[PDB]
Amino acid sequence: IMFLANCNIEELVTEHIKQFLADEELSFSGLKDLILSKAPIPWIHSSVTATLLKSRDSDKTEVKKNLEQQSYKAQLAEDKIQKEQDDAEALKDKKLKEVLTRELNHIPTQISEQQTELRLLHYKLERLFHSASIERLQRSINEREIKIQSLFEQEVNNKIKLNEIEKRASVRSQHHTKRVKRAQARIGYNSTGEDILSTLSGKNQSILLRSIQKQHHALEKKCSDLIQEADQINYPLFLEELQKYLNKKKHTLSSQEVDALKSVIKYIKQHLEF
């Protein structure tokens, strides 16, 4: 679970004070100055501070992993969706390209056919000079010409649609390249834990980095506050524990040394200023 959020700061400082006072070789003049200092014991505040930093580091590592894992999976899912849609569009365009091309390869034949029939109609009309006979040849001619116009329009339209297919193909090819690059990054990430960012699109890297930045700043602050707290309570706790140490006799101080330290201690304790 979490360290910083679950830190009892008083219990931590106490544990570190006790560990320090486990030293049975502390000296009179050493202890005397520490009492006189009315300040955090520097050795002890250092050790509490290192513990808090390690704890902060552990928290930061953990939440980063949670957020990275969220971003990793979301991008993977996006990429699988885009792949299926690209694949489906590709199949559709493949079929369209075939029909358009099959029609295109037949249009010159149709035009030739229509033109041949149109030529015979002009020949037949020339030979009429009823009508009736004349008017219905005219209508046949008009139909042939519209048909030929339509074929020429059919041709250029199929060519445009073939071009727009090439454009959509190029886009799918680009989408694929990027997916391959992210998939390559996943090989590296899944083996070292590094380079999460190359598995994400630019927009997703952004979302990931903001969530991490917010969390890291927060934990950094929380750690600074815990250090400041531990600083505030260090000295009074040490004085309490030192008294116990001075009564337990697990130490190398003479009876006179002990009494001399108690004199300094009571001087602090009965102080008119603090």
mmCIF file of C-alpha atoms in Angstrom:
data_model
loop_
_atom_site.group_PDB
_atom_site.id
_atom_site.type_symbol
_atom_site.label_atom_id
_atom_site.label_comp_id
_atom_site.label_asym_id
_atom_site.label_seq_id
_atom_site.Cartn_x
_atom_site.Cartn_y
_atom_site.Cartn_z
ATOM 1 C CA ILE A 1 0.000 0.000 0.000
ATOM 2 C CA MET A 2 1.049 3.663 0.367
ATOM 3 C CA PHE A 3 3.784 4.926 2.660
ATOM 4 C CA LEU A 4 3.515 8.720 2.949
ATOM 5 C CA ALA A 5 -0.261 8.697 3.375
ATOM 6 C CA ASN A 6 0.018 6.132 6.163
ATOM 7 C CA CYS A 7 2.966 7.667 8.012
ATOM 8 C CA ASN A 8 2.480 8.264 11.726
ATOM 9 C CA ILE A 9 5.127 10.959 12.009
ATOM 10 C CA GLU A 10 5.420 10.758 15.819
ATOM 11 C CA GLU A 11 5.924 7.004 15.777
ATOM 12 C CA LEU A 12 8.559 7.315 13.028
ATOM 13 C CA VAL A 13 10.637 9.921 14.856
ATOM 14 C CA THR A 14 10.362 7.888 18.059
ATOM 15 C CA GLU A 15 11.617 4.753 16.348
ATOM 16 C CA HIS A 16 14.593 6.711 15.048
ATOM 17 C CA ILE A 17 15.262 8.307 18.440
ATOM 18 C CA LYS A 18 15.157 4.904 20.117
ATOM 19 C CA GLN A 19 17.568 3.477 17.534
ATOM 20 C CA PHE A 20 19.967 6.349 18.202
ATOM 21 C CA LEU A 21 19.716 5.913 21.981
ATOM 22 C CA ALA A 22 20.473 2.194 21.542
ATOM 23 C CA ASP A 23 24.047 3.494 21.415
ATOM 24 C CA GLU A 24 25.514 2.613 24.811
ATOM 25 C CA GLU A 25 28.624 4.696 24.138
ATOM 26 C CA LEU A 26 27.211 8.231 23.970
ATOM 27 C CA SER A 27 29.300 10.794 25.881
ATOM 28 C CA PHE A 28 28.521 13.452 28.488
ATOM 29 C CA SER A 29 29.672 16.435 26.386
ATOM 30 C CA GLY A 30 27.920 15.067 23.314
ATOM 31 C CA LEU A 31 24.601 14.702 25.089
ATOM 32 C CA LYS A 32 25.020 18.015 26.934
ATOM 33 C CA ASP A 33 25.292 19.975 23.672
ATOM 34 C CA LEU A 34 22.351 18.160 22.131
ATOM 35 C CA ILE A 35 20.192 19.080 25.149
ATOM 36 C CA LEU A 36 21.416 22.679 25.095
ATOM 37 C CA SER A 37 20.712 22.986 21.367
ATOM 38 C CA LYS A 38 16.889 22.986 21.636
ATOM 39 C CA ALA A 39 17.008 21.880 17.984
ATOM 40 C CA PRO A 40 16.406 18.673 16.037
ATOM 41 C CA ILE A 41 19.203 16.147 16.677
ATOM 42 C CA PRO A 42 21.042 16.285 13.328
ATOM 43 C CA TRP A 43 21.915 12.592 13.094
ATOM 44 C CA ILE A 44 18.337 11.608 13.898
ATOM 45 C CA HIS A 45 16.650 14.151 11.647
ATOM 46 C CA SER A 46 18.894 12.932 8.811
ATOM 47 C CA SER A 47 17.804 9.324 9.325
ATOM 48 C CA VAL A 48 14.067 10.239 9.537
ATOM 49 C CA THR A 49 14.512 12.410 6.430
ATOM 50 C CA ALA A 50 16.118 9.535 4.444
ATOM 51 C CA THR A 51 13.276 7.207 5.428
ATOM 52 C CA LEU A 52 10.705 9.779 4.279
ATOM 53 C CA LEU A 53 12.451 10.314 0.943
ATOM 54 C CA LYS A 54 12.626 6.576 0.293
ATOM 55 C CA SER A 55 8.931 6.334 1.158
ATOM 56 C CA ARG A 56 8.121 9.238 -1.156
ATOM 57 C CA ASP A 57 10.168 7.615 -3.893
ATOM 58 C CA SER A 58 8.250 4.367 -3.426
ATOM 59 C CA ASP A 59 4.872 6.133 -3.628
ATOM 60 C CA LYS A 60 5.931 8.034 -6.761
ATOM 61 C CA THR A 61 7.080 4.852 -8.452
ATOM 62 C CA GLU A 62 3.818 3.081 -7.608
ATOM 63 C CA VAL A 63 1.330 5.698 -8.875
ATOM 64 C CA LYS A 64 3.377 6.267 -12.019
ATOM 65 C CA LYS A 65 3.023 2.543 -12.720
ATOM 66 C CA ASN A 66 -0.738 2.679 -12.207
ATOM 67 C CA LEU A 67 -1.086 5.678 -14.606
ATOM 68 C CA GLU A 68 1.332 4.216 -17.171
ATOM 69 C CA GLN A 69 -0.659 0.978 -17.149
ATOM 70 C CA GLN A 70 -3.884 2.870 -17.725
ATOM 71 C CA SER A 71 -2.385 4.785 -20.669
ATOM 72 C CA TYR A 72 -0.710 1.695 -22.097
ATOM 73 C CA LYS A 73 -3.940 -0.303 -22.215
ATOM 74 C CA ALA A 74 -6.095 2.529 -23.519
ATOM 75 C CA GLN A 75 -3.730 3.133 -26.439
ATOM 76 C CA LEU A 76 -3.557 -0.580 -27.218
ATOM 77 C CA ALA A 77 -7.354 -0.756 -27.367
ATOM 78 C CA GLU A 78 -7.502 2.373 -29.609
ATOM 79 C CA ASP A 79 -4.968 0.798 -31.936
ATOM 80 C CA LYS A 80 -6.926 -2.472 -32.207
ATOM 81 C CA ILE A 81 -10.089 -0.523 -33.041
ATOM 82 C CA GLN A 82 -8.373 1.602 -35.684
ATOM 83 C CA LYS A 83 -6.886 -1.562 -37.182
ATOM 84 C CA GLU A 84 -10.261 -3.254 -37.637
ATOM 85 C CA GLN A 85 -11.803 -0.145 -39.157
ATOM 86 C CA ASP A 86 -8.840 0.341 -41.479
ATOM 87 C CA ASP A 87 -8.944 -3.338 -42.471
ATOM 88 C CA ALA A 88 -12.671 -3.149 -43.207
ATOM 89 C CA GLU A 89 -12.319 0.014 -45.288
ATOM 90 C CA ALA A 90 -9.431 -1.594 -47.192
ATOM 91 C CA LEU A 91 -11.578 -4.607 -48.095
ATOM 92 C CA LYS A 92 -14.401 -2.367 -49.243
ATOM 93 C CA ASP A 93 -12.033 -0.267 -51.381
ATOM 94 C CA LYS A 94 -10.464 -3.431 -52.801
ATOM 95 C CA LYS A 95 -13.904 -4.446 -54.093
ATOM 96 C CA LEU A 96 -14.652 -0.971 -55.371
ATOM 97 C CA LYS A 97 -11.303 -0.744 -57.155
ATOM 98 C CA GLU A 98 -12.084 -4.026 -58.918
ATOM 99 C CA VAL A 99 -15.564 -2.989 -60.123
ATOM 100 C CA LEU A 100 -14.456 0.500 -61.210
ATOM 101 C CA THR A 101 -11.536 -0.974 -63.109
ATOM 102 C CA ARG A 102 -13.605 -3.715 -64.677
ATOM 103 C CA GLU A 103 -15.994 -1.030 -65.954
ATOM 104 C CA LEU A 104 -13.170 1.244 -67.164
ATOM 105 C CA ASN A 105 -11.613 -1.566 -69.224
ATOM 106 C CA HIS A 106 -14.955 -1.969 -71.009
ATOM 107 C CA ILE A 107 -15.856 1.676 -71.720
ATOM 108 C CA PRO A 108 -13.661 2.055 -74.887
ATOM 109 C CA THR A 109 -15.450 -0.994 -76.303
ATOM 110 C CA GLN A 110 -18.881 0.499 -75.516
ATOM 111 C CA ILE A 111 -17.951 3.842 -77.035
ATOM 112 C CA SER A 112 -16.710 2.083 -80.184
ATOM 113 C CA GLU A 113 -19.936 0.037 -80.335
ATOM 114 C CA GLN A 114 -22.177 3.083 -79.882
ATOM 115 C CA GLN A 115 -20.193 5.057 -82.447
ATOM 116 C CA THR A 116 -20.470 2.292 -85.015
ATOM 117 C CA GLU A 117 -24.221 2.162 -84.521
ATOM 118 C CA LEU A 118 -24.289 5.973 -84.611
ATOM 119 C CA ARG A 119 -22.409 5.933 -87.931
ATOM 120 C CA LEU A 120 -24.883 3.520 -89.489
ATOM 121 C CA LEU A 121 -27.745 5.771 -88.312
ATOM 122 C CA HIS A 122 -26.157 8.793 -90.026
ATOM 123 C CA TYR A 123 -25.753 6.693 -93.159
ATOM 124 C CA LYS A 124 -29.429 5.659 -92.997
ATOM 125 C CA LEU A 125 -30.531 9.282 -92.507
ATOM 126 C CA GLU A 126 -28.459 10.501 -95.447
ATOM 127 C CA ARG A 127 -30.269 7.950 -97.622
ATOM 128 C CA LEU A 128 -33.670 9.489 -96.811
ATOM 129 C CA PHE A 129 -32.866 12.627 -98.796
ATOM 130 C CA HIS A 130 -43.332 9.379 -94.223
ATOM 131 C CA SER A 131 -40.851 11.018 -91.814
ATOM 132 C CA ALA A 132 -41.838 9.306 -89.457
ATOM 133 C CA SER A 133 -38.806 7.633 -91.058
ATOM 134 C CA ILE A 134 -36.844 10.857 -90.612
ATOM 135 C CA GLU A 135 -38.020 11.697 -87.080
ATOM 136 C CA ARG A 136 -37.381 8.261 -85.573
ATOM 137 C CA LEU A 137 -33.870 8.094 -87.052
ATOM 138 C CA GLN A 138 -33.325 11.504 -85.433
ATOM 139 C CA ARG A 139 -34.468 10.167 -82.063
ATOM 140 C CA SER A 140 -32.217 7.119 -82.403
ATOM 141 C CA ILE A 141 -29.308 9.417 -83.213
ATOM 142 C CA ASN A 142 -30.099 11.576 -80.166
ATOM 143 C CA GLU A 143 -30.171 8.504 -77.918
ATOM 144 C CA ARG A 144 -26.829 7.236 -79.265
ATOM 145 C CA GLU A 145 -25.170 10.603 -78.623
ATOM 146 C CA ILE A 146 -26.459 10.889 -75.064
ATOM 147 C CA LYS A 147 -25.252 7.353 -74.414
ATOM 148 C CA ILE A 148 -21.785 8.215 -75.710
ATOM 149 C CA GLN A 149 -21.687 11.388 -73.625
ATOM 150 C CA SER A 150 -22.642 9.348 -70.575
ATOM 151 C CA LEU A 151 -19.883 6.811 -71.185
ATOM 152 C CA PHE A 152 -17.285 9.586 -71.362
ATOM 153 C CA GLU A 153 -18.661 10.952 -68.075
ATOM 154 C CA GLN A 154 -18.646 7.429 -66.637
ATOM 155 C CA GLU A 155 -14.981 7.172 -67.579
ATOM 156 C CA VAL A 156 -13.734 10.341 -65.905
ATOM 157 C CA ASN A 157 -15.895 9.659 -62.805
ATOM 158 C CA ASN A 158 -14.473 6.184 -62.345
ATOM 159 C CA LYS A 159 -11.028 7.685 -62.696
ATOM 160 C CA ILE A 160 -11.764 10.219 -59.944
ATOM 161 C CA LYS A 161 -13.044 7.422 -57.683
ATOM 162 C CA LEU A 162 -9.914 5.448 -58.402
ATOM 163 C CA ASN A 163 -7.831 8.438 -57.347
ATOM 164 C CA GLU A 164 -9.774 8.951 -54.098
ATOM 165 C CA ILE A 165 -9.187 5.248 -53.375
ATOM 166 C CA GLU A 166 -5.457 5.775 -53.708
ATOM 167 C CA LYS A 167 -5.748 8.652 -51.254
ATOM 168 C CA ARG A 168 -7.573 6.530 -48.691
ATOM 169 C CA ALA A 169 -5.024 3.740 -49.207
ATOM 170 C CA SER A 170 -2.163 6.116 -48.440
ATOM 171 C CA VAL A 171 -3.848 7.199 -45.238
ATOM 172 C CA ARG A 172 -4.329 3.588 -44.074
ATOM 173 C CA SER A 173 -0.668 2.934 -44.832
ATOM 174 C CA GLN A 174 0.335 5.868 -42.619
ATOM 175 C CA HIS A 175 -1.951 4.674 -39.791
ATOM 176 C CA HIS A 176 -0.327 1.251 -40.024
ATOM 177 C CA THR A 177 3.221 2.580 -39.864
ATOM 178 C CA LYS A 178 2.420 4.482 -36.623
ATOM 179 C CA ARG A 179 0.766 1.398 -35.111
ATOM 180 C CA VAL A 180 3.875 -0.650 -35.969
ATOM 181 C CA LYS A 181 6.115 1.950 -34.318
ATOM 182 C CA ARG A 182 4.017 1.899 -31.128
ATOM 183 C CA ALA A 183 4.020 -1.907 -31.215
ATOM 184 C CA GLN A 184 7.801 -1.846 -31.479
ATOM 185 C CA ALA A 185 7.969 0.393 -28.398
ATOM 186 C CA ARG A 186 5.779 -2.061 -26.524
ATOM 187 C CA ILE A 187 8.451 -4.749 -26.952
ATOM 188 C CA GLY A 188 10.927 -2.506 -25.140
ATOM 189 C CA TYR A 189 8.445 -1.361 -22.500
ATOM 190 C CA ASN A 190 7.192 -4.854 -21.719
ATOM 191 C CA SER A 191 10.752 -6.035 -20.988
ATOM 192 C CA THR A 192 12.401 -3.115 -19.095
ATOM 193 C CA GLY A 193 9.507 -0.968 -17.922
ATOM 194 C CA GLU A 194 11.046 2.055 -19.681
ATOM 195 C CA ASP A 195 9.845 4.156 -22.640
ATOM 196 C CA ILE A 196 6.118 4.073 -21.910
ATOM 197 C CA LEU A 197 5.782 7.265 -23.958
ATOM 198 C CA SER A 198 6.734 5.716 -27.322
ATOM 199 C CA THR A 199 3.779 3.349 -26.959
ATOM 200 C CA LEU A 200 1.411 6.356 -26.965
ATOM 201 C CA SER A 201 0.183 8.874 -29.532
ATOM 202 C CA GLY A 202 1.257 12.464 -28.895
ATOM 203 C CA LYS A 203 -2.135 13.367 -27.451
ATOM 204 C CA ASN A 204 -2.022 10.385 -25.081
ATOM 205 C CA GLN A 205 1.550 11.110 -23.924
ATOM 206 C CA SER A 206 0.130 14.478 -22.881
ATOM 207 C CA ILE A 207 -2.693 13.025 -20.824
ATOM 208 C CA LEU A 208 -0.256 10.591 -19.197
ATOM 209 C CA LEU A 209 2.328 13.218 -18.373
ATOM 210 C CA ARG A 210 -0.153 15.617 -16.791
ATOM 211 C CA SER A 211 -1.527 12.918 -14.507
ATOM 212 C CA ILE A 212 1.998 11.970 -13.449
ATOM 213 C CA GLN A 213 3.103 15.568 -12.968
ATOM 214 C CA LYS A 214 0.129 16.296 -10.701
ATOM 215 C CA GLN A 215 0.738 13.158 -8.608
ATOM 216 C CA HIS A 216 4.484 13.695 -8.272
ATOM 217 C CA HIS A 217 4.157 17.354 -7.256
ATOM 218 C CA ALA A 218 1.567 16.340 -4.681
ATOM 219 C CA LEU A 219 3.712 13.550 -3.168
ATOM 220 C CA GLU A 220 6.773 15.833 -3.212
ATOM 221 C CA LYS A 221 4.840 18.428 -1.184
ATOM 222 C CA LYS A 222 3.463 15.788 1.181
ATOM 223 C CA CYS A 223 7.010 14.607 1.815
ATOM 224 C CA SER A 224 8.224 18.161 2.464
ATOM 225 C CA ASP A 225 5.422 18.621 5.021
ATOM 226 C CA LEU A 226 6.205 15.352 6.803
ATOM 227 C CA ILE A 227 9.852 16.327 7.027
ATOM 228 C CA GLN A 228 8.901 19.712 8.475
ATOM 229 C CA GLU A 229 6.582 18.015 10.980
ATOM 230 C CA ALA A 230 9.225 15.514 12.067
ATOM 231 C CA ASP A 231 11.589 18.470 12.434
ATOM 232 C CA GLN A 232 9.115 20.251 14.726
ATOM 233 C CA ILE A 233 8.696 17.353 17.139
ATOM 234 C CA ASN A 234 12.241 15.906 17.118
ATOM 235 C CA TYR A 235 13.716 17.800 20.069
ATOM 236 C CA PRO A 236 10.921 17.377 22.644
ATOM 237 C CA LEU A 237 10.663 13.655 21.851
ATOM 238 C CA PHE A 238 14.407 13.212 22.187
ATOM 239 C CA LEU A 239 14.385 14.879 25.601
ATOM 240 C CA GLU A 240 11.657 12.455 26.779
ATOM 241 C CA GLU A 241 13.488 9.404 25.501
ATOM 242 C CA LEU A 242 16.825 10.588 26.825
ATOM 243 C CA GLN A 243 15.404 10.747 30.326
ATOM 244 C CA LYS A 244 14.386 7.083 29.938
ATOM 245 C CA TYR A 245 17.832 6.196 28.600
ATOM 246 C CA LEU A 246 19.363 7.972 31.595
ATOM 247 C CA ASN A 247 17.310 5.821 33.969
ATOM 248 C CA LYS A 248 17.700 2.447 32.255
ATOM 249 C CA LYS A 249 21.475 2.327 32.814
ATOM 250 C CA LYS A 250 22.153 0.774 29.386
ATOM 251 C CA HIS A 251 24.947 3.307 28.894
ATOM 252 C CA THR A 252 28.521 4.117 29.951
ATOM 253 C CA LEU A 253 27.937 7.348 31.835
ATOM 254 C CA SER A 254 29.099 7.745 35.431
ATOM 255 C CA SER A 255 26.618 8.516 38.209
ATOM 256 C CA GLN A 256 27.922 12.091 38.319
ATOM 257 C CA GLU A 257 27.632 12.421 34.534
ATOM 258 C CA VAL A 258 24.004 11.287 34.660
ATOM 259 C CA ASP A 259 23.158 13.778 37.392
ATOM 260 C CA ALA A 260 24.933 16.560 35.498
ATOM 261 C CA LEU A 261 22.826 15.831 32.408
ATOM 262 C CA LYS A 262 19.645 15.811 34.483
ATOM 263 C CA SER A 263 20.646 19.245 35.739
ATOM 264 C CA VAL A 264 20.763 20.548 32.148
ATOM 265 C CA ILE A 265 17.522 18.759 31.300
ATOM 266 C CA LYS A 266 15.591 20.235 34.216
ATOM 267 C CA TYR A 267 16.987 23.646 33.257
ATOM 268 C CA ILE A 268 15.367 23.378 29.810
ATOM 269 C CA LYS A 269 12.164 21.912 31.259
ATOM 270 C CA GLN A 270 11.590 24.649 33.860
ATOM 271 C CA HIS A 271 12.653 27.433 31.469
ATOM 272 C CA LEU A 272 10.764 30.744 31.829
ATOM 273 C CA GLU A 273 11.004 31.441 28.061
ATOM 274 C CA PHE A 274 10.682 27.883 26.661
#
